[PDB]
Amino acid sequence: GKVHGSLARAGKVKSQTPKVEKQEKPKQPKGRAYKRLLYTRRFVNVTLTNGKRKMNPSPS
Amino acid sequence: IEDALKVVLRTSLVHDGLARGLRESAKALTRGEGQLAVLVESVTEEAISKLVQGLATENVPLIKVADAKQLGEWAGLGKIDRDGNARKVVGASVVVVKNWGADTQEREILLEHFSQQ
Amino acid sequence: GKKRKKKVYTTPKKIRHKHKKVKLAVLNYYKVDDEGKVAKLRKECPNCGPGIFLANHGDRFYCGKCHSTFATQK
Amino acid sequence: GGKKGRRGKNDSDGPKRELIYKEEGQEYAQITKMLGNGRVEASCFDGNKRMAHIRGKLRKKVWMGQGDIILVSLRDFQDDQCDVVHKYNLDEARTLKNQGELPENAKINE
Ligand SMILES: [Mg+2]
Ligand SMILES: [Zn+2]
C-alpha cells in the first residue's frame, strides 16, 4: 500500500538492504609503492589526455 | 556395401523418401510406396521385425543392417550442426526408402545383388 | 489513469489436452500369420486408399484422414 | 480552482482505489480537533488520544478536516505521538464500519 510496514522504524533501510560480500581483492601495495603506482598511473601513463585527467572515469 | 546405403539415404532424405519410423513404414509398405527397407535385429521382443518381414511378404527387398542408434545416426535423423554428433541419442530402428531419387551404379549393382540373394 | 486489480477467476482450471501416446501402438493394428502372411486387425478406409485403419469406438467405424466425412455404423 | 492546478502532478486516481488495511502498528483513528503547525489530534480506536503529525506525501497533497477517518502509524519508542499516513475519503470508511475493524460506537455520517 502507501507504506509497506510501520513507518520510521529506527534503521529501516539498513535492515532491509541486501548484504553483499566483499570481493577477493588482491593485495594493494602500500607505502612508497602506492606513491610510485600513483606517479606511474598519472604522469608517465597518461591515459585520457582529452579533457581533464578524469581519474576514475565512469564507464558509459 | 556401406557406401550405397548412405547414398540411398541421402537420395531419399533430399526428396523425402525415408519413412522414418515404423507406422509410416508400415503404411508405405501396405501402399505401393516402400521401395527399400533397412531394419535392425537388435530389437527387444523382436515382434516389430517380424511384422516388418510379414508386411514385406505382401516392394520386396529388405536389408539387415544392425546398430539401430548408428542406423539413425547415418540415416540423417540428426540435425548434425557441428562436425561431431551434437545429439545425445537418436535412432530409427526401421527405415523405408520410397523415392529412389538420384541413381549411382554401385548402389544399383548392390540392390540387384541383394534382390538375387 | 487506470486502476486495475489482480484478476480473480471463478473457475478451477482448464488443462491442455495431452495427446494419448501409445507405446508399441503400430503392432496392435496388425497380426502376423506365423512367419509369412499378415492380416490387419482394424478395417481399411476406402476414401483414402489402402493402409489407413478405421477407428472403432461403439457401433460405428471412423476414419482419421478424411475423418469428418466417414463415420459408418457397424 | 486556480492556475495552481496545471503545475501539479495531474495524478488522477478518480476511479475507486483499493482501500488499505492496518498492518502491525498502523491503526485506524478519527480526527478530533485541528491544531496548528500541520499537526492533528487523532482519537485512536483503543481509548487513547494520540497526537498525529500531518506527514510527508500528505501535507499539501490532500486536505483533511475535523471528523475524518484516518490511518496512522505509531512509534514504538514514543507511543504518545504518531504520523498520519493515509486518508480514506468517506466511502471505504463505510465499508470498514460494516466490517467493524473500529468500534461502531464512533458513528460519523453526513
Ligand atoms: Mg500537465
Ligand atoms: Zn478416410
Automatic annotation (TrEMBL), chain A:
GO biological process, one term: translation
Gene Ontology terms for molecular function: structural constituent of ribosome
Keywords tagged on the record: Ribonucleoprotein, Ribosomal protein
Highest taxon above the source species: Eukaryota
Stretches the record annotates as Disordered: 1-34
Pfam families registered for this protein in UniProt: Ribosomal_S30
Keyword Kinase: no
GO cellular component, one term: cytosolic small ribosomal subunit
Family: Belongs to the eukaryotic ribosomal protein eS30 family.
Protein name: 40S ribosomal protein S30
UniProtKB/TrEMBL annotation, chain B:
Any Pfam family the entry gives: Ribosomal_L7Ae
Any one cellular-component term (Gene Ontology): ribonucleoprotein complex
Protein known as: 40S ribosomal protein S12
Species annotation: Kluyveromyces lactis (strain ATCC 8585 / CBS 2359 / DSM 70799 / NBRC 1267 / NRRL Y-1140 / WM37) (Yeast)
InterPro entries linked to this entry: Ribosomal_eL30-like_sf (IPR029064), Ribosomal_eL8/eL30/eS12/Gad45 (IPR004038), Ribosomal_eS12 (IPR000530), Ribosomal_eS12_CS (IPR047860)
Highest taxon of the lineage: Eukaryota
Family classification: Belongs to the eukaryotic ribosomal protein eS12 family.
Transmembrane segments: none
Gene Ontology molecular function terms on file: structural constituent of ribosome
Tagged with keyword Ribosomal protein: yes
Keyword annotations: Ribonucleoprotein, Ribosomal protein
GO term, biological process aspect, one: translation
PANTHER family recorded: 40S RIBOSOMAL PROTEIN S12 (PTHR11843)
Residue ranges constituting the Ribosomal protein eL8/eL30/eS12/Gadd45 domain according to the UniProt record: 4-96
